[PDB]
Subunit: 79 residues, 2 copies
């Protein structure tokens, strides 16, 4: 049940890009939500289950190739 | 700042599909978040500003054609 925070420029295409990029593999997410940080910054948050390290590993690296996305950080912390 | 509650099966694919429709019509979304209501049901929330009712009206009807989505309800707050 590890979450993921995808940071990207505040746009209307970047969001669909992240959702689409991950959707390409029908990655069933337990929770998807995006909120604007300040102004030109869009912070997305995807909560899903884990299984294969190759997919979770390639996922992060893949997001890096997403033009406009700052970086990705696995959200979780204590509880 | 009206919101929208889209109920659909717990699948990110549904969220991405709904987001695609929004961007397709230049629908600038301020924010969004979906959570699993029970088991095979996920409540998706979307916050976006609008002015024309024809677009907001057609959007709801369009969402109905989204395979997996039970129904949509305009979310709002007061005070």
């Amino acid at each position: 049940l590890v979450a993921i925070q995808v940071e990207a420029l505040d746009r209307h295409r970047l969001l669909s890009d992240v959702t689409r990029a991950l959707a390409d593999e029908k990655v069933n997410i337990l929770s998807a939500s995006v909120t604007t940080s300040g102004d030109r910054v869009a912070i997305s948050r995807f909560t899903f289950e884990m299984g294969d390290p190759k997919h979770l590993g390639h996922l992060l690296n893949a997001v890096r190739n997403v033009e406009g996305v700052y970086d990705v950080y696995r959200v979780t912390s204590a509880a």
